[PDB]
């Protein structure tokens, strides 16, 4: 039952600082070190350093010294990582991992990760537009519908179709940044005998702006 619960997504301004957490459970917290890892959008992993909760001692990758500060709270079995003087290069996903020592560290447990976005842009809800065919895809036994989730910030947004009842023919694309605003699309392909005969709706959620959208796809 070893579990590592990390804090949620973070949006911070350049030059600011942020502190993420990793709450452990299912084992004796002070008996194992807690390591942190960085993964920048679209690439490899980087080890940051570790904290030993039993003594408060920490060791860092030379590259992150004075950038990351690792601490731990024995009473709440939580590890913390502070990042200072934030720059765009700090935007990434950060994970905590609790390794066991055998022939060497074995990182057998990982948190779900916390996404950090360093930007001066402000939170903005998405505009969700229905993507309905214009009488031409009919020649295809299958009809493709979609939803354009435009101009939101920051990431992420979740998209489901018919509240999860339609998942097989779904393609939700990675958001792309345009003029400091995210735009993404999601398509769903169903038999022409399914729509418009039946209702097809895209459910879009944008946590950062507490937005919930249920956009029905009408001809």
């Amino acid at each position: 039952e070893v579990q590592l619960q990390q804090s949620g997504a973070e949006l911070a301004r350049p030059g600011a600082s942020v502190k993420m957490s990793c709450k452990a459970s299912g084992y004796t917290f002070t008996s194992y070190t807690m390591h942190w890892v960085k993964q920048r959008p679209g690439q490899g992993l980087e080890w940051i350093g570790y904290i030993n909760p039993s003594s408060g001692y920490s060791n860092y990758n030379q590259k992150f010294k004075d950038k990351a500060t690792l601490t731990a709270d024995k009473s709440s079995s939580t590890a913390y990582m502070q990042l200072s003087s934030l720059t765009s290069e700090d935007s990434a996903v950060y994970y905590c991992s609790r390794p066991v020592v055998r022939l060497g560290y074995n990182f057998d447990y990982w948190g779900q990760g916390s996404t950090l976005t360093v930007s001066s842009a402000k939170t903005t809800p998405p505009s969700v537009y229905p993507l309905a065919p214009g009488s031409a895809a009919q020649t295809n036994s299958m009809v493709t519908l979609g939803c354009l989730v435009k101009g939101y910030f920051p990431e992420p947004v979740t998209v489901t179709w018919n509240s999860g009842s339609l998942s097989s023919g779904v393609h939700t694309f990675p958001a792309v940044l345009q003029s400091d605003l995210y735009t993404l699309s999601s398509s769903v392909t169903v038999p022409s005998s399914t729509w418009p005969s039946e209702t097809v709706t895209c459910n879009v959620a944008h946590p950062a702006s507490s937005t919930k959208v249920d956009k029905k796809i009408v001809p």
Binding site: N61, G104, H171, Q178, L184
Partner: protein, 210 residues
Amino acid sequence: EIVLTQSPAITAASLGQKVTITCSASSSVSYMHWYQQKSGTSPKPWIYEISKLASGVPARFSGSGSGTSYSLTISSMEAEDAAIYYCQQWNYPFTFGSGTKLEIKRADAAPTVSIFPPSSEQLTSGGASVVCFLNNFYPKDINVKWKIDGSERQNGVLNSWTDQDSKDSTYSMSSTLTLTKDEYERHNSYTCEATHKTSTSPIVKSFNRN
């Protein structure tokens, strides 16, 4: 500085084939670990200390090597094996390898193209995005071209690509032409053209505003 380079960078294996990926260390290292990462999820320990399988790892996987060269082998490729694999130095600074993207090889498939005129509600708000989906094609390489009144439009389109489909192992792409209601009404013909290796002829989808 020790640098870990993995190969192949990317490869498409057919179900049932043996797969071997490697990790080369700039200088000798005593042990090497491996991880498996699937889109949008935390890396999962896969192999520890060169050859010990982690929890949740199928027996078809095996690790080996020493010094400056290590390998991860899948006796027989299975669909669930498609992912990105990373090797990692066993000790400080715990450097990670460049990664290997293992995909599923399947038959070539031409893209199904769908074009979408701006929605009434976006137009009412003064905007006009034209969307085009190039879905379920294979291999992954593809190009999209937009023509407005017969003229190709460069730089001014947002493109995005999905990873291999967990179901039919195909790829999909979305291309969006963003205009103002005014710009959109300025012209009448909108065309999305997809060129895939499956044909020397682009798959064209178009619509007339009026």
